[PDB]
C-alpha cells in the first residue's frame, strides 16, 4: 500500500503514536515519508546483507527475522515480512519498542536529518484526524 500524509497520520494516531514518549504525531509521519515515503512494501537490501522493511524501514539484522541475515537479531521478535503488511500495527509496535527501548527516534537518521528540529506539526496540518 502507499498511504497519504493524512491517511498515515490517522492510522499512526489510532495506533497511539501521537506523543508516544514525548514525540508529537508529526514526528512519526515525517519519519515514514523519509524512510518508506509512505510505501508499506518498501524494502531496501543493504550491503551488510540486511534489509530494511516497510513504512519505517526497520532493519533485518536487528529487529526482525528475514532468514537472509546470518547474525541477525529479532529484537521485536517478529518475521520481517510482518513489517510489509498493508496494516501498520506491525511496524508501529516494533517502532515503539525501538524508540522506547532507550534508542529514541534518533534511531532513524532520516528523522534526525529531515525531521528533528523542524516544525513537524506540518505533516498533519490539514488532516481530519
Amino acid at each position: 500500500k502507499v498511504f497519504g500524509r493524512c491517511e498515515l497520520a490517522a492510522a499512526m494516531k489510532r495506533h497511539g503514536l501521537d506523543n508516544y514518549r514525548g514525540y508529537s504525531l508529526g514526528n512519526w509521519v515525517c519519519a515514514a515519508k523519509f524512510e518508506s515515503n509512505f510505501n508499506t512494501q518498501a524494502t531496501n537490501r543493504n550491503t551488510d546483507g540486511s534489509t530494511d522493511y516497510g513504512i519505517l524501514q526497520i532493519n533485518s539484522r536487528w529487529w526482525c527475522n528475514d532468514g537472509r541475515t546470518p547474525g541477525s537479531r529479532n529484537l521485536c521478535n517478529i518475521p520481517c515480512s510482518a513489517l510489509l503488511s498493508s496494516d501498520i500495527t506491525a511496524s508501529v509496535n516494533c517502532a515503539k519498542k525501538i524508540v522506547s527501548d532507550g534508542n529514541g527516534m534518533n534511531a532513524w537518521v532520516a528523522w534526525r536529518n529531515r525531521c528533528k528540529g523542524t516544525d513537524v506539526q506540518a505533516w498533519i496540518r490539514g488532516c481530519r484526524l
Epitope: 543493504n46 551488510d48 524501514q57 539484522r61 537479531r73 529484537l75
Partner: nanobody
Framework: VQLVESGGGSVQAGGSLRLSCTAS????????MGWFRQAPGGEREAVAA????????YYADSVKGRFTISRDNAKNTVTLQMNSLKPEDTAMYYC??????????????????????????WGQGTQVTVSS
C-alpha cells in the same frame, strides 16, 4: 557504556602499530566503534569506523589504504592496525562507540565523517608517536 583502550606508543616511520578497544558496555551493542585522533595543532579528526554487526568499514582518506579496523574475538573489541605509519599520524587516538541501535540501516562512516554525530561514548585516548 564504558570503553577501554590498549596498544599505542611510539613507532618508527613506515612502521605498523596495533591499537585495541573493548566496549565494556555489555547490553545490546554498541552499533558502531571507530577511532578519532588529534594532534596539538588540530581539531579532532576521524580515523576509522567499523560496523559491529555486518562488519562494514569506513576510513578517512587520510588513513584509508594503510590503516585497518576490524573486530577482535573478545566481545565488543575492535582493533585498529596502523600500517605504513607517517609522523603526520602522530597524535592522540580516541576510541568511540555509538550506543544507539538504529532502526533502519545506518552506516558508521556517516557519523565518523561528520565530526562524530552519534558516537556517545569515548575513550581516554592513547598517544601514538611516529618518530620520523
Amino acid at each position: 557504556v564504558q570503553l577501554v583502550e590498549s596498544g599505542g606508543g611510539s613507532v618508527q616511520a613506515g612502521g605498523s602499530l596495533r591499537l585495541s578497544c573493548t566496549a565494556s558496555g555489555y547490553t545490546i551493542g554498541p552499533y558502531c566503534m571507530g577511532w578519532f585522533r588529534q594532534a596539538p595543532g588540530g581539531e579532532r579528526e576521524a580515523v576509522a569506523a567499523i560496523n559491529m554487526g555486518g562488519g562494514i568499514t569506513y576510513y578517512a582518506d587520510s588513513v584509508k589504504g594503510r590503516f585497518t579496523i576490524s573486530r577482535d574475538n573478545a566481545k565488543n573489541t575492535v582493533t585498529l592496525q596502523m600500517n605504513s605509519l607517517k609522523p603526520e599520524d602522530t597524535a592522540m587516538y580516541y576510541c568511540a562507540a555509538d550506543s544507539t541501535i538504529y532502526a533502519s540501516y545506518y552506516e558508521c562512516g556517516h557519523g565518523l565523517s561528520t565530526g562524530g554525530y552519534g558516537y556517545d561514548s569515548w575513550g581516554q585516548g592513547t598517544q601514538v608517536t611516529v618518530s620520523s
